[PDB]
Design a protein around this ligand. Structure first.
Ligand SMILES: Cc1cccc(Cl)c1NC(=O)c1cnc(Nc2cc(N3CCOCC3)cc(S(C)(=O)=O)c2)s1
Length: 268
């Protein structure tokens, strides 16, 4: 089951997202606690209802630090609502772009370990995410990153593009892209390349280059996430283990991969 919340306990305060089938609000739940609130407004279809309550059902089956926590649902009254913990810093991709250069390498790798721990939990629960990307991670005031969006060519593994094979191993590919997004403070993967140019480049063997100021071990790990052969990629358990060891021995992050500069500045 899922906890049913009475609408008198829910106060919507500000719109923070979505729209056209409902909105996402910041609000308070009854001292009161901050929550996020997603609505499903009148006229919703049967498929929208099973998708809406399905997301709440899927989230209600999970209990992990790096997975968005469900507070409850409003299903007996209209509009229906999903109420979750409130993540004060919003989506990770936008967050990183607005905080460019403001974190330590150790902080950035800690964000990746949390995302990986969430993904290990999901994969072991037999949940394939299919849309892992910094835009679908949320960040709270403890800098904890949590996977969201339960129920994008340049985040997607080749086998998922080519023949629709989505597995935890294609989520691992996506996690490698997320690593690159985090270490670059939200750079767009493959910059201005078109979707067709990205697929072509990947098939030809090209991979995203090293971010600036990126630990050698971190670049090596994202490169292994991008193995063409699915069976050669690390499992999330391997990823979590490696990230944990690097954080525990933080001097290991001071060895940087060489950064290939695109622009030559020479001063006499
Ligand atoms: C309510 C809900 C229902 C189903 C699934 C989920 Cl994952 C949720 N919960 C959420 O969507 C959210 C929980 N916390 C959130 N914090 C949040 C907070 C913000 N901001 C807070 C700081 O000021 C900038 C905007 C922005 C976003 S968003 C929509 O642009 O990614 C999100 S959203």
């Amino acid at each position: 089951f899922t906890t049913e919340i009475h609408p008198s306990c829910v106060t919507r305060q500000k719109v923070i997202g979505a729209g056209e089938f409902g909105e996402v609000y910041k609000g308070m739940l009854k001292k009161e606690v901050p929550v996020a609130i997603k609505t499903l407004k009148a006229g919703y279809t049967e498929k929208q209802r099973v998708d809406f309550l399905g997301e709440a059902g899927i989230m209600g089956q999970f209990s992990h630090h790096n997975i968005i926590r469900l507070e409850g649902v409003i299903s007996k009254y209209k509009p229906m609502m999903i109420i979750t913990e409130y993540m004060e810093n919003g989506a990770l991709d936008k967050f990183l772009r607005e905080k460019d250069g403001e974190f330590s390498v150790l902080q950035l790798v800690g964000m990746l370990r949390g995302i990986a721990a969430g993904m290990k939990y999901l994969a072991n629960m037999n949940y394939v995410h299919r849309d892992l990307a910094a835009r679908n991670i949320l960040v709270n005031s403890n800098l904890v990153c949590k996977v969201s969006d339960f129920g994008p060519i340049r985040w997607t593994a080749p086998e998922a593009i080519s023949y629709r094979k989505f597995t935890s191993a294609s989520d691992v590919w996506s996690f490698g892209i997320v690593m690159w997004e985090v270490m670059t403070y939200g750079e767009r993967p493959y910059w201005e390349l078109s979707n067709h140019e990205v697929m072509k480049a990947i098939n030809d063997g090209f991979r995203l280059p090293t971010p600036m100021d990126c630990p050698s071990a971190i670049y090596q790990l994202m490169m292994q996430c991008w193995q063409q052969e699915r069976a050669r990629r690390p499992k999330f358990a391997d990823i979590v283990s490696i990230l944990d060891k690097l954080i525990r021995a933080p001097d290991s992050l001071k060895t940087l991969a060489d950064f290939d500069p695109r622009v030559s500045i020479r001063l006499p």
